Design a binder for these strands. Structure first.
Length: 42
RNA sequence: ACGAGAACAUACGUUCUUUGAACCAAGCUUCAACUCC
């Protein structure tokens, strides 16, 4: 009923999506093939 | 009752003049605020 979480805001308080989240999502998308895509990716 | 007796190797004189510890060099790289009740 409570304990609400919060969308990411800047210091101006407008919501936005950080580019790192989309990059991590796309990293999970690209790593479908080559699951052992290693620590030292290029 | 000495090749002897006296007799300062002494006086003046800047280790000084000229000179960039400089030059080139991204605190950066890969990184989901997420997971399970």
């Amino acid at each position: 009923m409570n304990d609400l979480n919060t969308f990411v805001k800047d210091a101006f308080g407008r919501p936005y999506i950080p580019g790192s989240s989309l990059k991590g999502a796309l990293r999970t998308a690209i790593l479908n093939d080559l699951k052992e895509d290693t620590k030292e990716n290029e």
